[PDB]
Each structure stands twice: as C-alpha cells, then as structure tokens.
C-alpha cells in the first residue's frame, strides 16, 4: 500500500523504464536480437493491451 | 386517430435488412406526421440531420417531433404502432446510456461516445435509419444545462479561453460512461433560450424576498461547514431583527418567485415520455409506462 | 432607438469604474456601402489622449515603445503585444437599420420628442446606430483628446475612423407610483445635432445630444489647451506615417544594395532572355518604374500586407517550430525504422504578395497576390496565379515587380527576371507603430457561430431589409 | 496514394527496404532484379 | 572518454560497416561469440537495473 | 540538381520490337533525357 518500491523503476518515463521497455528502447540504437528477463516487466503496451 | 401506421419500403429488402428490421422490433421511431401511412424517407433522423446546423436545432426539431414503437414488420411492411398514455409498454433502448429502475426517459439526439464507429446501420444508398437517444432524466437535463451554459459564457469571449472551456464542458459523464456534446452552436434558439433565462433571472432578482438575499450570510454567521463553505466560496469572489415582517408580504413575494423559477426551470427540463419499471439483466430492453 | 438608452444606462451604471461618458453615433451611406452595413458583426472604440496614449496601456511609458528588430521568433513581442492591444480596444452595442428613413421623421414618428432649432430633414439610405465612450481620468474632459472607430465585418476585414474631442465637442460643453427612465427619456427627447469628421476628413458621421443623458449632471469641466493640442498632432503625425517610413526603408535598402552590388544584377526569377536586346531601354524603364513606385505606394503595399500576418499570434510559435524543424542533424537509422512518421517539410510552394508597375501607361497594382515555387531544372523562382496560371507579367518589357516574401525577403526584378535582393529592416520603428497600425482581428464570440473552433462557418447572418423583419 | 500505401506499408521491415533502396549510391536498376508474379499466401512470422 | 570506458570495460569499438549492417543489425542481428569450454550451460544474463 | 528522384512506370504496347519501343519512349521522355545532358553538362567529375 505503497505508491512504489523503486521509483527509478516504476515511473512512466523513469531510467528503467527508458532502458527495458521495448516501446522506449527502439527509439534506442537497439539489437533486437537479445533476450531480456526484463522485457514483460517493462513492455508496458502488450501487457496493457 | 390511428393507432396503427404502416411505413412501406420504395427499395427492394435484403434478408439481412428483414432480419435486422425484426430485431428492431420494440424499439422507439421518431415520425414528423402522426399519419396512416409514410413513406420510409421520412422515417427517421437522417431527414433532418445536417450537422452545420447544430445540435439545438436537432433538439428543437425532434422535441416537437412525435414518437411510434415497432411492431410487425415483415416483407416491406412495417406497421409502427404509436403508444398512448399510460399504458405499460416493451421498449428497447439502443444508446449505450444505462438504465436503472425506477428512472423516467427522455428523448434526444444522439450524442458521441468512445467507440468512435457510429455504426452507419441500415443504409438503403443514401437513406440510413439514425434512431435517437432515449436519456434518463439526470443525464438529458445535464445534456440542456450544460448546452445554456455553454451558450451564455461563449458570448463576447475569445476563441483560446473557450477552447478550455468547452473541452472541459462539453464532455459529461455519466454512470461511468464517456459523452460528448457533438455540436454545440449559437442559434437564434438557443439566444431566445438565453433571453428567456437572463429575464428569469433577473424577474428572480427583482422580486425576491428581502431575507433570502441575507438568509445565506445569517447562516454563515450561524455555521461552518463543507456545504456551507462552498456557499460562501461562490458568493465571496463579490463580498439581527428586520426592521419590518409581514407574512402576506412574504407569501405572495414566494409564489411570484415561484412562477419565475418555473418559467426558469424548464429551460433544461425535457418532458418525460417514458418511467421504467423493468430491467433486463443485459440492460437491453426494458419495460416502461408512457406519458404524454 | 434602444442601443442609445441602453448605453445611456449602461454607461451611467460603470462611470464609477470606466469614467467614460457615452456619446451616441449614427452613421450612413456616407461611411460604408449598404453591404458593409447589411454585413456588420462589432463595432470597436478605443481612446488615445493628447499625450499619444492609449486607454489600455501603462501610464508611465511601456516596453511596446522599444523598437523590434525584424527577426520572426520575437515576432514584434509576440502574444503578449496582441492581448495588450486586445485589452485597449473596446466593444459597443449597435444596431442595423436597412430601410431607408430620416432620423428627424423615424424618431418623431418613435416615442422621442425631437426639438432641434429648425426641421431641416436629414434622409439616408441605411442607419447603423452605436454609442461610444471617451474616458476623462478625473471630472476633466479635454479636447485634445482622439476617439478611434472601427467597423468589423464576418470575413475579418476592419476600416479604421478617428477623431478628435474638439470636433465631437465644439460648443457641446458651452451650452451649460414612480417615474421609469425610458418615460423621462422619451419625452425630454433630443435637440442638437451636429456633423463630425475624421481628421483626415474622409468620413461624416452625426452625432446625437439627448438632453436625459447623465453625463449633464455631473458638472464636468472641459478645457483645450493650445500646446496640447499641439502634442496631438505630431503624435498624429507619428502614427499616419508607418506604412510610408517602410516604404521609405525598402527604397533606400534597394539603393544600397543596387549600390554594393556594383550594378551588376544577378537573374532569380526564370526567364529566356537575349544577347541582342537593347537592355539601356531595360534600364532606363527600371529607373522610370521605380520612380512610379516610389510616387504611388499605399497603404495596401505588399511589404505592408506581408508584415500584417507576422504580428498574429501565431506567427511565434510557427516561427519556433519552423526554426527547431530546421535546426536538426541527419535522422537517426532507429527514427526512420521506428516510430511516428518524419515530420513534413517546408512545401515547395509558397504564397508571397507583389506590388507591379507599368510605364507604357500610369498604372500600378499593390494587393496583388502571387505563388511562387522553384524551377527544378535551373533552381529559379517560377511566378503562378493564385489559380495556378502563370504569371506572364515578368515577359512584358514595360513591367518591373516587387516581391516580398513571407520572412520579410523582398525581390526587385526588372524584365528578364534579373533581379534585387534585400532583407526589410523593420528595426527603424517601435513595437508600438507597428503593432497599433496594423494587426488582424482576432474574433470574439457571437451569433451563428460554431463554438467549436476551426468548424465551417455557417450562412453570414446579414441582418436585411430586403427581405420582410425576421422574428 | 502516397500517402495511403505508406501508411498501409509500416513496419520495421518495409521502413528498412525504403531506407536500403536510398543508402547506396546505385541506381535503382542495379540493386533491383525482377521476379514473376504471385500466387499464394501461408501468413506467419514469416510468411511462404 | 569513449576509449577510456571501452578500455575500462573490455569491450572494442563499435566497428561496423555502418550503413547497410546498422540498418540490418536493427532489424535483428546476431552478434556476440560463444565462449570456448562450456561446463555450465547457457549463460543466464543477469539484467541489471 | 541536388538529387535523383526516379519514375516507375508499367508500359503496355504492342510494339515487340526494341528499336520502335526505344524510340516512341526516347520521344515521351524528352524532358528526362533532356535533364540527363544538363547535368552531364552542368557537373563534371560525376558520371550520370
């Protein structure tokens, strides 16, 4: 009952956001090719959709 | 005089127009002439509906307008059937506006919502059978007040402050639900409208008895509370025994202040033409007494 | 009738905020044409007193006194100088009449008891009633003062009237149950009429007295002093003289640049020329069309017309976006795989306005409207119609043509599309000439109007008399 | 039609061919090579 | 700094025919080399945020 | 003159043989080839 945990991470546009969601991240000079742990975390739009 | 009219179909009929016609079967029909008999390009909303010419004058239009439910229809033959007062009736709602016992309906244009389709059901080429919104009361009468409001700040304002203004008016919700007014304009309607209430209003100044213009500030000076605060919030951006008292003074000041709110109030109130007692657990059709 | 009473009422109800007494106008064909009239959406007012000043802006002097220097992003001051002058300009209540009538038969023949001193009548074709007011900052009115008129119509046209105290009030001020007012006002009804005109004497105009209005009572004190009046015509003088310093300004920078270029005229706009032309007769033309030009630039000049659509308030935030849109390096391999769409670019299309000469015959075209776009094949200025003709004009051996661009660029071209090219220095006036002298209407709320912006406007309202009262 | 078969065509796929058919500095003879013509569709990830 | 970093960091410089294997690369590409001797298995990047 | 922007077009002709084709579309797209020697003309060193 928190607002967060990690606010570096649970922000809209905060660092871990930019870095991992894939919506942020192909904005990036980004090598799709790698798997992340991290993506379903962070791919806000398909867990949304 | 008729209780039966028969609408008759110059175009020839699908199947899938035969069965989306005996689906329709209960809804409410707008017709211009409380006639036997009526062609099908006079069925409906889309004869009247140039949307230049905003949604004021489609409310004046269809106020005056006379309502049918739908009944037999078959084979290019439609047979709508016009209710009298007070019997019970099966009527189908088609807006997605949610109804819950005990409400009364009102009729009005459709409005906007999120879905954004509009679903151009029913186009015979060019003919396309629009069919209005039957509204509860709270939800119509907002859809009026909001619209006199609109046209009675718009007035001698510039077009920036009212961009904010209307983005912020013109969107109301309801149970939930996501409308919009489609087009608010300034017709010589709504300015007759506005003459009316701005008479009212200040008949309401005028006449008014001498301790209700003070009966809030005594209160003030009695109470404090959130109601109250808010009271005082509005009349503070412009901010003992009387001398005399006489009951009959009071009583005939009271009942002329009466007769000016009323001639106020139903600027915004629609005449009521449907009060449900039924709801289908799917909020699709309900069962309701007509007024007349 | 009723526009005068009400402002009477209306004025009496704010004198002790505004201190502006009311003074109630009737204009006729005179003024404006009957489709003006017809066709009328606000009337306008705005007070300057002896000093220069508007009525709506700071007292002491303000930072719209300090020159612009021509660049588009402070576009001379941006919003903020167009919500002051919109804070300066003030709107009356007006009323359209378009049957013809005589004011002394119409308003015996309404409630009013006219008594003017003879029954001399006076007709008109049209009437469009309306009353202004002119602030006296203390119970002094003075007669140097200058009362501004403006008549707006739907499309956001406006005509600019003005004049002053002494004319409006030349022997006004040496003539010095219960009881509704419009009774009281009806029947002590009006006597003195009197005819005024623009300083420039360029419009007639009468003026009403009625002898119930509130402004009597107050025993004001009136009194015109012959420095300051004095002071009001050179501030006349300052403000009259905009458009012709600018055209002054084009005509010493092409001089300059004719200069420093050593004569030698370099071709920008695309046209086949010969080896064996005379071009003495080219240049001697040049010289007779730019003399013509310099004799009958107006108002409407094109330089003038291009710097109107700057000083909207659109201009600064186009102007920031046009800037960073430039303002940019190569894209990005991961913007162009990924994401929204490039933004669009600059068209290759524009529209410019030109001002044309001709020395076969006397004659010159100023509001001329021009497109102009890039020969791909030689890089040059290709001149098209506003219907997409070609403009053949630059063919014609007795035509030179001004251009001026939408950045304020201005091009002299000569025949064979030769041409002179400069920058407008707008930096030889303050903000305040330029912003007061010109500038778009910016419309205001009203009837028959969407309240939607940008929706399509609807029928022109056009109050009529040819058709029967509508109710 | 510009504008229609451009937003029809987005993807990172047909964004990356546009960007190669421009990059080098050839002729579009050269880098192109003609096949016949289609007939079928198997939709998928990647598509038969 | 950008040497300094790599130096620090072990890794090379982003050595690429920059045009066209940029554009494939983010349209997907496979470009890290496998360790020689592998005794545990795959290796589990630990993604950091 | 900065850049090249291409046509494509889809012929359908009964001429089969190449040197008419060739000819009728030298005489359609004269102001292509005329483009060609202007900036063959125009800008040495490069080789259109």
């Given at each position: 009952f928190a607002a967060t945990h990690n606010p570096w991470a649970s922000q809209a546009g905060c660092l871990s956001d930019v870095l991992?969601?894939?919506?942020?991240?192909?904005?990036?000079?980004?090598?799709?090719?790698?798997?992340?742990?991290?993506?379903?975390?962070?791919?806000?739009?398909?867990?949304?959709? | 005089m008729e209780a039966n009219i028969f609408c008759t179909f110059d175009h020839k009929l699908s199947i899938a127009d035969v069965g989306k016609l005996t689906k329709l079967v209960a809804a409410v029909v707008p017709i211009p002439q409380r006639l036997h008999l009526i062609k099908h390009y006079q069925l409906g909303l889309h004869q009247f509906v140039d949307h230049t010419r905003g949604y004021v004058r489609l409310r004046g239009l269809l106020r005056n307008m006379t309502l049918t439910l739908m009944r037999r229809v078959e084979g290019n033959q439609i047979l709508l059937h016009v209710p009298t007062h007070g019997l019970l009736y099966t009527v189908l709602n088609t807006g997605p506006v949610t109804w819950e016992k005990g409400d009364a309906l009102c009729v009005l244009p459709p409005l906007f919502h999120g879905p954004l389709?509009?679903?151009?059901?029913?186009?015979?080429?060019?003919?396309?059978?629009?069919?209005?919104?039957?509204?509860?009361?709270?939800?119509?009468?907002?859809?009026?007040?909001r619209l006199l409001i609109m046209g009675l700040f718009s007035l001698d304002r510039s077009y920036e402050e009212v961009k904010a203004a209307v983005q912020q008016l013109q969107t109301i919700t309801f149970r939930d639900a996501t409308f919009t007014i489609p087009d608010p304009v300034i017709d010589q309607h709504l300015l007759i409208d506005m003459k009316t209430a701005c008479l009212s209003m200040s008949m309401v100044a005028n006449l008014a008895s001498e301790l209700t213009m003070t009966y809030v500030r005594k209160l003030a000076l009695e109470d404090?509370?959130?109601?109250?605060?808010?009271?005082?919030?509005?009349?503070?951006?412009?901010?003992?025994?009387?001398?005399?008292?006489?009951?009959?003074?009071?009583?005939?000041?009271?009942?002329?202040?009466?007769?000016?709110?009323?001639?106020?109030?139903?600027?915004?109130?629609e005449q009521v033409v449907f009060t449900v007692c039924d709801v289908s657990p799917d909020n699709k059709s309900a069962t309701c007494i007509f007024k007349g | 009738m009723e526009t005068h009473l009400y402002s009477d009422l209306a004025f009496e109800a704010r004198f002790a905020d505004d201190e502006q007494l009311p003074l109630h106008l009737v204009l006729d064909q005179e003024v404006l044409s009957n489709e003006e009239a017809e066709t009328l959406r606000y009337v306008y007012y705005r007070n300057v007193d002896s000093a220069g000043r508007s009525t709506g802006r700071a007292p002491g002097g303000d930072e719209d006194d300090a020159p612009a220097s021509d660049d588009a992003e402070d576009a001379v001051g941006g919003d903020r100088a167009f919500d002051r002058e919109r804070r300066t300009w003030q709107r009356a209540c007006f009323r359209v009449l378009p049957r013809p009538l005589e004011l002394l038969?119409?308003?015996?023949?309404?409630?009013?008891?006219?008594?003017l001193e003879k029954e001399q009548r006076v007709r008109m074709f049209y009437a469009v009633f309306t009353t202004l007011g002119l602030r006296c900052p203390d119970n002094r009115l003075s007669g140097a003062q200058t009362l501004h008129l403006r008549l707006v119509w739907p499309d956001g046209s406006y005509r600019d009237w003005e004049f002053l105290a002494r004319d409006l009030l030349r022997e006004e001020m040496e003539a010095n149950d219960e009881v509704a007012r419009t009774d009281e006002w009806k029947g002590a009804g009006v006597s003195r009429l009197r005819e005024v005109?623009?300083?420039?004497?360029?419009?007639?105009?009468?003026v009403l007295w009625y002898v119930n209005s509130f402004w009597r009572s107050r025993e004001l004190s009136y009194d015109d002093h012959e420095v300051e009046l004095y002071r009001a015509l050179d501030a006349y003088r300052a403000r009259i003289a905009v458009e012709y310093v600018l055209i002054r300004a084009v005509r010493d920078e092409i001089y300059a640049v004719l200069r420093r270029d050593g004569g030698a005229l370099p071709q920008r706009f695309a046209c086949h020329v010969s080896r064996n032309m005379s071009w003495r007769v080219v240049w001697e033309l040049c010289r007779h069309a730019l003399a013509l030009w310099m004799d009958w630039a107006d108002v409407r000049s094109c330089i003038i017309k291009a710097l109107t659509p700057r000083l909207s308030r659109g201009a600064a935030a186009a102007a920031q976006r046009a800037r960073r849109q430039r303002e940019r390096s190569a894209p990005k391999p991961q913007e162009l795989l990924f994401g929204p769409r490039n933004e669009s670019g600059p068209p290759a299309e524009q529209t410019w306005y030109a001002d044309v000469v001709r020395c076969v015959r006397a004659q010159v075209?100023?509001?001329?409207?021009?497109?102009?776009?890039?020969?791909?094949?030689?890089?040059?200025?290709?001149?098209?119609?506003?219907?997409?003709?070609?403009?053949?004009?630059?063919?014609?051996?007795?035509?030179?043509?001004?251009?001026?661009?939408?950045?304020?660029?201005?091009?002299?071209?000569?025949?064979?599309?030769?041409?002179?090219?400069?920058?407008?220095?707008?930096?030889?006036?303050?903000?305040?000439?330029?912003?007061?002298?010109?500038?778009?209407?910016?419309?205001?709320?009203?009837?028959?109007?969407?309240?939607?912006?940008?929706?399509?406007?609807?029928?022109?309202?056009?109050?009529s008399g040819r058709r029967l009262p509508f109710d | 039609t510009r504008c229609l078969l451009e937003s029809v065509y987005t993807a990172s796929a047909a964004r990356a061919a546009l960007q190669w058919l421009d990059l080098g500095p050839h002729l579009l003879h050269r880098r192109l090579e003609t096949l016949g013509c289609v007939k079928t569709v198997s939709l998928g990830i990647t598509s038969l | 700094v950008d040497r300094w970093i790599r130096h620090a960091a072990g890794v090379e410089r982003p050595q690429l025919l920059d045009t066209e294997t940029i554009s494939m690369l983010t349209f997907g590409s496979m470009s890290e080399r496998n360790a020689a001797a592998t005794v545990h298995g795959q290796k589990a990047a630990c993604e950091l945020i | 003159g900065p850049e090249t922007r291409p046509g494509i077009y889809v012929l359908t002709s009964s001429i089969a043989h190449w040197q008419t084709l060739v000819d009728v579309a030298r005489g359609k797209f004269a102001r292509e080839r005329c483009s060609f020697v202007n900036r063959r003309i125009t800008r040495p060193r490069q080789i259109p």
């Open positions: 991992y969601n894939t919506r942020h991240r192909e904005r990036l000079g980004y090598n799709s090719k790698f798997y992340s742990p991290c993506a379903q975390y962070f791919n806000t739009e398909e867990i949304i959709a | 389709a509009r679903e151009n059901l029913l186009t015979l080429g060019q003919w396309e059978l629009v069919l209005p919104w039957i509204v509860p009361m709270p939800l119509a009468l907002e859809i009026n007040q404090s509370s959130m109601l109250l605060v808010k009271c005082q919030e509005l009349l503070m951006r412009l901010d003992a025994r009387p001398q005399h008292v006489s009951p009959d003074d009071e009583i005939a000041r009271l009942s002329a202040l009466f007769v000016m709110l009323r001639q106020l109030d139903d600027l915004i109130r | 038969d119409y308003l015996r023949q309404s409630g009013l008891t006219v008594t005109w623009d300083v420039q004497h360029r419009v007639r105009l009468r075209d100023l509001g001329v409207e021009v497109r102009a776009a890039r020969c791909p094949r030689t890089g040059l200025w290709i001149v098209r119609d506003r219907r997409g003709r070609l403009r053949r004009w630059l063919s014609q051996p007795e035509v030179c043509v001004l251009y001026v661009t939408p950045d304020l660029d201005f091009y002299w071209v000569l025949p064979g599309g030769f041409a002179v090219s400069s920058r407008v220095t707008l930096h030889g006036l303050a903000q305040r000439a330029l912003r007061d002298r010109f500038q778009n209407f910016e419309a205001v709320l009203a009837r028959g109007m969407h309240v939607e912006a940008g929706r399509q406007e609807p029928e022109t309202p056009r109050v | - | - | -």
